[PDB]
């Protein structure tokens with residue numbers, strides 16, 4: 287609570303969010319974004335939580351074109367609870383407030399959504415989000431310049447057997 | 451991605467100007483989204499953000515515009531491990547055998563029957579990070595294995611960094627804010643401000659190794675191929691510590707490239723070196739920036755930017771909307787000569803006619819010459835010593851150039867490459883008279899929209915990456931958020947588009963509206979002031995609380 291935002295949209299659905307603080311600003315951003323892109327964010331959060339195979343089976347791929355099960359192993363490893371906790375503890379109060387607001391605004395849209403702009407209405411993976419989910423997305427972006435480019439290679443790393 | 455910042459010495463108005471042309475995915479977790487954020491009195495910034503991140507990534511404010519491009523710096527290092535000769539799950543550091551750590555993760559998998567099964571997977575880790583296997587290149591055998599240390603795993607500053615950038619007043623303030631926090635993971639930053647400063651920074655999170663350590667700590671075979679790789683059996687090859695760095699083991703801000711100018715700076719994903727050739731950036735760590743041949747996009751930009759004439763907004767816009775295939779400048783004159791030398795060869799007739807008629811563009815109406823040229827270039831790239839003038843470090847803007855047709859073996863191989871390219875084009879399903887916009891499209895529901903631009907590897911500034919799907923090339927990435935910002939007295943004047951539109955959802959009214967505009971190359975005002983916003987006849991407003 288204490289979450290409030292004023293949103294204006296100009297041509298082509300560009301939002302202009304005004305708020306008195308970061309929590310309200312995040313609230314407006316999460317709500318406006320969800321109106322346009324709820325399905326996208328839910329799918330990418332499933333990916334960053336390492337839950338693709340749970341919803342979609344091992345036959346599918348992520349939007350990064352990695353197989354679901356290797357992608358899940360990689361993100362389960364990347365986004366372990368200890369790592370998320372340490373990341374959160376290092377965030378400034380302003381950043382924490384932006385993220386808390388964003389999750390609440392996205393979730394507000396989901397509570398009210400009737401399918402007008404949301405094609406995945408009713409899917410089991412379209413779920414309320416948590417600030418931890420936004421940290422999972424942040425960490426996924428962080429490693430795009432490093433270990434994320436070696437995700438398949440990390441999953442493939444197994445010690446030698448008895449071979450010649 | 452491309453970026454050009456123009457300063458007071460080259461802009462027509464004597465103030466700053468910025469062209470932002472990031473090349474990013476059209477789908478997924480890196481799909482840009484436009485927004486304007488305001489906390490009255492202390493924050494007012496507009497641009498585009500990435501999914502789930504409540505900050506503007508590329509944007510502008512009252513006196514400043516900035517953008518980013520992917521850099522050539524290393525943001526990780528591989529470590530080659532020497533394994534314990536008695537145990538391949540142990541590795542040696544200074545001759546001492548250490549055990550690998552094991553971290554198991556468990557994943558639920560939905561089966562054929564619809565039920566969940568649990569899969570457990572072991573991730574092996576060294577003191578550097580997890581082990582990685584690239585079959586036939588980075589193996590884990592009984593002698594060696596590779597671990598990967600990613601510098602951004604410890605970068606907890608990334609969100610704070612962009613929130614700070616969003617609050618930056620001018621170029622000097624932006625530089626202070628970035629150098630102070632060092633939270634940028636893997637991009638360059640270019641910016642311009644109202645007073646006419648143009649800034650380039652290669653200020654990101656980069657593993658630090660003191661210069662005296664590099665010759666012995668590098669893996670010679672891998673660094674030769676551009677892979678950051680170090681000797682993991684020697685404790686002296688640990689990332690160096692410097693108290694001035696924001697994070698243990700990263701390069702201090704003072705050692706990373708910065709160029710502040712009043713004429714221009716540019717980057718198209720090459721190193722810092724030729725950001726502005728009047729002041730080359732040299733002498734950095736090989737992990738940071740190297741003097742390598744520049745790509746055709748940077749060569750194109752420098753060809754348009756060098757000289758003394760003022761640059762207007764329209765000039766920068768037209769660098770994007772021209773869809774000029776700059777790589778054709780390097781080879782098409784000699785290709786046409788080869789064509790004339792082989793008049794009456796049936797295997798070359800259609801290709802040579804298509805190439806001669808071609809506008810050297812990737813416009814919607816560009817002829818099939820572009821397709822012949824692309825298939826030829828993919829084959830030319832595999833030829834040995836076919837350049838008439840190879841890369842010359844003393845002439846990096848104009849080399850390589852031309853085909854060495856005077857060399858018989860090259861002439862034979864080039865002609866064969868063109869015959870082979872022609873055979874491939876003619877095999878595929880291309881109706882005669884069809885144009886580039888007939889082939890390259892973005893699907894929107896049951897419909898398609900023709901998309902101008904072409905691959906950045908062919909020197910098209912408006913870079914578009916596509917993949918074959920059925921009868922068409924489907925756009926998957928490239929030009930995304932465009933912003934062109936100038937600074938007239940009344941407030942920032944910004945123009946651009948989000949090529950793939952605000953919404954990824956087919957149901958949305960904003961699923962293809964800007965994509966129709968992008969097809970027609972009709973950029974629009976990005977409204978920022980209350981006056982601009984209130985003038986929009988489509989204006990809607992909602993206030994929400996809980």
Ligand SMILES: CCCCCCCC(=O)O
Pocket residue numbers: 427451471472473474507508518519520635636637
């Ligand atoms: C940390 C993400 C920064 C992304 C900005 C865009 C860079 C580019 O256009 O290549």
